[PDB]
DNA sequence: ATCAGAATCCCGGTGCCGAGGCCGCTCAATTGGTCGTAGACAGCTCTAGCACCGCTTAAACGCACGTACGCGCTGTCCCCCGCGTTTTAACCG
DNA sequence: GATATCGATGTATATATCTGACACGTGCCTGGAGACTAGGGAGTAATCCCCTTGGCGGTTAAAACGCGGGGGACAGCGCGTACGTGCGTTTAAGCGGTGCTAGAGCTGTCTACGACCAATTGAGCGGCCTCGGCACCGGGATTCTGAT
């Protein structure tokens, strides 16, 4: 799964960031392996629309 | 606040450390001596501690920021951290 | 094995030694029994973890003292270790 | 002194620039610093005890891994 | 009669109860033996602390009965006890009898 | 005005507001739906209903705490999601 | 009917306990998600608790198995058994 | 909606120091016999497991009137963001 | 309109009474104390070595102050609205119990098996030879956004 995500990420070799993305991709892996994170953690774009200044 | 979200994305891609040798080193060294003097810390271990600390900081600050979105627009407060910590159970 | 072992009776004995008039309720009795059994299993697991990790194929006094130190806060465990070391030395010396 | 200044203001600002927080405050830095001392002191104390049981007085990678596994929220360090 | 270790050690808590585990559970070939008395003493002193805290908590409400509500109140008045069981919540906890200014009238 | 009376009354009493028979029946149905022909203890059902009650009252205390934090009393689903995400179980 | 009792679990009780918790008003979109995630949580709890009991070749779910399953889940509660 | 600006995303060249990999060895992995020992299956004691019942009604569900507040707009000031410049120190060696 | 009776019907005011729950003892049961024999494991310390702190220089991106500045928590008001509170309906929750029966837990029996012991041998990592993407500095494509 990390290799498929890395190929999607346009990189030939595995890095911990790709491992983080692979872990966060599956919801069951977030359920079970959510107690452990790996260096420079990441998450899907769950940003809202209230951070930007309103007009 | 609008370029800040762009900087959020930039630091999201970043995958390297920040303060390993000269700083955090002096920190853990100091605390170590405080408990028991004449202690040392493996370089790989130092890196692992810094990454664990920064990852936990990222998660907890993200939690506090989403709690601060409930207080309207964008502004953090001490009570945000305190409340969140209590809710989770850290406090 | 057929006799349903309970651990709240030992707490009851200490209570009767201190304040035999007052006592606990049935649900509360279940709560303290579950607490005692949980702490019992946690210290057993702590001993197992320490024994596995340090290749510690034994567990006399230092191992369980370290388990007590890990389980409990620093100051309270340190005082408990002090009286425990005194007690075990006295017990060995007395016979 | 330099114990509280080990981590600078823009360092926490970078940790907020990668940790969601878009608006920060002076007191927030101090709170996060104190939380960091609590966390670091807990881990270092656990490591001190574990490296005192085996009479070594220095932590290895595996020592750090076991010390952080005791906190419940386990982590996977380098080496092993 | 039969010289058991309870009277010799001066401890009401069961001694070889742990020895049961060590023997039948076959944990290791070198496990426990001295562990019983140690953990028994630690459990006794922790139970004494918890009993004192519960007794202090009960008397605050001019009542002399023990309920797990009062256990939750005593635990939640302790920050260290909270950090010990932060991922735990005891049933019937409710809220405290002291009411904040947010709910009371002007 | 009756909110004060209700708060005092609910502080004086502690009866389990979730009933044992509907939750027992729900547990039996769901368990037999997953794995058929298994028995369930009454004590286990009582413990599970206590666990669910404690979980929901803790979650709702957190929700109230977040509400009064944002100078409000009524709450939106976002707060519940917030609490679950900080707890990390979601 | 001894099936399809997802609607069986009642929201008024959660509302009354929230009132006991201080809450003076709730919403309609809340229970829509609350009930779903409560059902998901109950499904997971029942699944792991009945998985726990299966070891000892038993057919009935015992109290200590449920308590230790919640303990492994990190959302433990103490009761009569355990 | 639409053009210009700052930051960002991917790529190129270089330092290197920790990664990619060869060889021994030695302490561990495997195979083979014993057999008392401890797990799997039939049976004793009996407890509570699945489902429903007499009777009363507390409470869940559905519905009516309206108020505290949900959500949005407006005033403020103070209190932290944007940027130029200096030092200063983090990672390098 | 007043003075002096009759009663009457909530309103306490106790007074037994009997019932769920807590607190003590009791028959008995099963597992630890004593104890000897026999196997191993960490306390203590020496020894190779390595590796992480201290330190000198550098040098260029980051910390931090000065100045400009604008925007958003707080407070209050206003349109709406949705449950707050209560009334009508219904329906099984609960107290206490039963019909049918399954297995909790243990007991007995039975039969595959892993510590122990010994010979054979090989996989992982230390040591060490060789090398290549992380990190930093710089440029082209991508994304978001200010101002209009």
Sketch out chain G's domains with CATH numbers.
1-82 (1.10.20.10)
Cα angle A19-A24-A30, degrees, rounded to a multiple of 5: 115
* CA dihedral angle for residue E7, residue E13, residue E14, residue E18, rounded to 10 degrees: -130
Q: Do D73 and A36 touch (CB under 8 A)?
A: yes
* Token couple for F58: 């803790």
- Tell me the DSSP string of F21-87: HHHHHHHHHHHHHHSSS-EE-HHHHHHHHHHHHHHHHHHHHHHHHHHHHTT-SS--HHHHHHHHHHH
3-state secondary structure (DSSP) of residue E87: coil
Nearest of C14, C7, C3, C13 to residue C30 by alpha carbon? C7
Beta bridge mates, B8? none
Q: Do B65 and D60 touch (CB under 8 A)?
A: no
Chain B residues 18-77 within an 8 A CB cutoff of chain D = 18-19, 23-24, 26-28, 30-32, 35-36, 38-42, 44-45, 47-49, 52-54, 56-66, 68, 74-77
DSSP 8-state symbol, D70: T
* Token couple for G70: 């919640």
* Token couple for C88: 């075990």
User: Using the CB atom, is residue D74 less than 7 Å from strand I?
Assistant: no
* Token couple for C87: 């007690």
Alpha helices by DSSP H, listed for G1-82, are 11-20, 28-53, 63-73
* Token couple for C95: 């016979």
| C-alpha radius of gyration, chain B, whole number | 17
DSSP 8-state symbol, E60: G
Beta bridge mates, F39? G60
Nearest of A37, B38, C52 to residue D19 by alpha carbon? A37
Nearest of G61, G15, G55, G12 to residue F30 by alpha carbon? G61
- Do D73 and D42 touch, CB atoms closer than 8 A? no
CA B66 to mean position of chain CA atoms: 16
- Do A42 and A21 touch, CB atoms closer than 8 A? yes
User: Using the CB atom, is residue C13 less than 7 Å from strand I?
Assistant: no
3-state secondary structure (DSSP) of residue G62: coil
Which contacts (CB < 8 Å, 24+ apart) does range F53-56 have?
Answer: F53/E91, F53/F16, F53/F17, F53/F18, F53/G17, F54/E89, F54/E90, F54/E91, F54/E93, F54/G77, F55/E89, F55/G41, F55/G75, F56/G14, F56/G17, F56/G38
**Subunits with 3+ C-beta pairs closer than 8 A to E:** B, C, F, G
Nearest of C5, C33, C11, C34 to residue C23 by alpha carbon? C11
Q: Which residues contact E76 (CB under 8 A, 6 or more apart)?
A: E82, E93
User: Using the CB atom, is residue D23 less than 7 Å from strand H?
Assistant: yes
Q: From CA E91, how far away is CA E72, in angstroms rounded?
A: 8
Chain G residues 8-67 within an 8 A CB cutoff of chain F = 8-10, 13-14, 16-27, 29-30, 32-34, 37-38, 41-43, 45-47, 49-50, 59-63, 65-67
3-state secondary structure (DSSP) of residue E77: coil
For G23, counting Cβ atoms within 10 Å of its Cβ (0-12 exposed, 13-18 middle, 19+ buried), the class is buried
Q: Do A15 and B14 touch (CB under 8 A)?
A: no
DSSP 8-state symbol, A26: S
Q: From CA E46, how far away is CA E37, in angstroms rounded?
A: 14
- Do E32 and E18 touch, CB atoms closer than 8 A? yes
* Token couple for G50: 């009945």
User: Which of C39, C65, C88 shows the shortest C-beta gap to E43?
Assistant: C39
Q: Do G38 and F75 touch (CB under 8 A)?
A: no
Distance separating the N- and C-terminal Cα atoms of chain C: 32
Q: From CA G24, how far away is CA A17, in angstroms rounded?
A: 45
User: Using the CB atom, is residue B40 less than 7 Å from strand I?
Assistant: yes
Q: From CA B28, how far away is CA B32, in angstroms rounded?
A: 6
* CA dihedral angle for residue E45, residue E48, residue E53, residue E58, rounded to 10 degrees: 170
Q: CB-based contact (8 Å) between B91 and chain E?
A: yes
Overall size of chain C counted in residues: 95
User: Which of D49, D54, D70 shows the shortest C-beta gap to C54?
Assistant: D54
Q: For residue D72, list chain C residues with Cβ-Cβ distance below 8 A.
A: none
User: Using the CB atom, is residue E21 less than 7 Å from strand I?
Assistant: no
Distance separating the N- and C-terminal Cα atoms of chain A: 43
Q: Which residues contact B89 (CB under 8 A, 6 or more apart)?
A: E82, E83, E86, E87
- Which of D76, D79, D80 should we substitute to test contact with A (largest number of A Cβ atoms within 10 Å)? D76
Q: From CA G2, how far away is CA F29, in angstroms rounded?
A: 7
User: Which of G13, G37, G63 shows the shortest C-beta gap to F47?
Assistant: G63
Q: For residue C27, list chain E residues with Cβ-Cβ distance below 8 A.
A: 68
Q: From CA B30, how far away is CA F22, in angstroms rounded?
A: 59
User: Which of A41, A47, A53 shows the shortest C-beta gap to B2?
Assistant: A53
Chain breaks in chain C (C to N over 2.5 A) after: none
Touching status, chains D and C (3+ beta-carbon pairs under 8 Å): yes
Distances (CA, A) of D41 to B32, E88, F8, G82: 8, 24, 43, 34
Residue E5, Cβ neighbours under 10 Å: how many?
Answer: 14
Nearest of E32, G23, D5, E48 to residue B27 by alpha carbon? D5
SS3 annotation, C38-67: HHHHHHHHHHHHHHHHCCCCCCCCHHHHHH
SS3 annotation, chain B: CCHHHHHHHHHHHCCCCCCHHHHHHHHHHHHHHHHCCCCCECHHHHHHHHHHHHHHHHHHHHHHHHHHHCCCCCCCCHHHHHHHHHHHCCC
- Do C31 and C52 touch, CB atoms closer than 8 A? no
String of b and e for E72-84 (b: at least 16 CB within 10 Å)?
bbbbeeeeeebee
- Do C70 and D46 touch, CB atoms closer than 8 A? yes
Distances (CA, A) of E106 to D33, E102, E103: 39, 9, 9
Q: From CA B54, how far away is CA A41, in angstroms rounded?
A: 9
Q: From CA D18, how far away is CA D13, in angstroms rounded?
A: 9
Q: How far is B47 from chain D (nearest CA, A)?
A: 9
Q: Count helices and strands (H / E) in chain E.
A: 5, 0
């Amino acid at each position: 799964l990390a290799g498929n995500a890395a190929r999607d990420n346009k990189k030939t070799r595995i890095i911990p960031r790709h491992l983080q993305l692979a872990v966060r991709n599956d919801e069951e892996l977030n359920k079970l392996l959510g107690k452990v994170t790996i260096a420079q953690g990441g998450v899907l774009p769950n940003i809202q629309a209230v951070l930007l200044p309103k007009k | 606040g609008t370029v800040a979200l762009r900087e959020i994305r930039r630091y999201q891609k970043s995958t390297e450390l920040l303060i390993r040798k000269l700083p955090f080193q002096r920190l853990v060294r100091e605390i170590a001596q405080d408990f028991k003097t004449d202690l040392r810390f493996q370089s790989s271990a130092v890196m692992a501690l810094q990454e664990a600390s920064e990852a936990y900081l990222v998660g907890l600050l993200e939690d506090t920021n989403l709690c601060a979105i409930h207080a309207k627009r964008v502004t953090i407060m001490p009570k945000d951290i305190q409340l969140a910590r209590r809710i989770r159970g850290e406090r | 094995r057929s006799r349903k072992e309970s651990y709240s009776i030992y707490v009851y004995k200490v209570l009767k030694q201190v304040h035999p008039d007052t006592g606990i309720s049935s649900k509360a009795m279940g709560i303290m029994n579950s607490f005692v059994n949980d702490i019992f299993e946690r210290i057993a697991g702590e001993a197992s973890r320490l024994a596995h990790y340090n290749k510690r194929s034994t567990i006399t006094s230092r191992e369980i003292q370290t388990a007590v130190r890990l389980l409990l806060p620093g100051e309270l465990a340190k005082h408990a270790v002090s009286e425990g070391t005194k007690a075990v030395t006295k017990y060995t010396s007395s016979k | 002194r330099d114990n509280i200044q080990g981590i600078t203001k823009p360092a926490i600002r970078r940790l907020a620039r990668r940790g969601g927080v878009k608006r920060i405050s002076g007191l927030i830095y101090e709170e996060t610093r104190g939380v960091l001392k609590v966390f670091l002191e807990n881990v270092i104390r656990d490591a001190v005890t574990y490296t005192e049981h085996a009479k070594r007085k220095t932590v290895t990678a595996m020592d750090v891994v076991y010390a952080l596994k005791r906190q419940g929220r386990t982590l996977y360090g380098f080496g092993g | 009669k039969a010289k058991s270790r309870s009277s010799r050690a001066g401890l009401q808590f069961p001694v070889g109860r742990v020895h049961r585990l060590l023997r039948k559970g076959n944990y290791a070939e070198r496990v426990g033996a001295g562990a019983p008395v140690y953990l028994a003493a630690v459990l006794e002193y922790l139970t004494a602390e918890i009993l004192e805290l519960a007794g202090n908590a009960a008397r605050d409400n001019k009542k002399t009965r023990i309920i797990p509500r009062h256990l939750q109140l005593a635990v939640r008045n302790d920050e260290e006890l909270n950090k010990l069981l932060g991922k735990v919540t005891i049933a019937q906890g409710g809220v405290l009898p002291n009411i904040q200014a947010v709910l009371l009238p002007k």
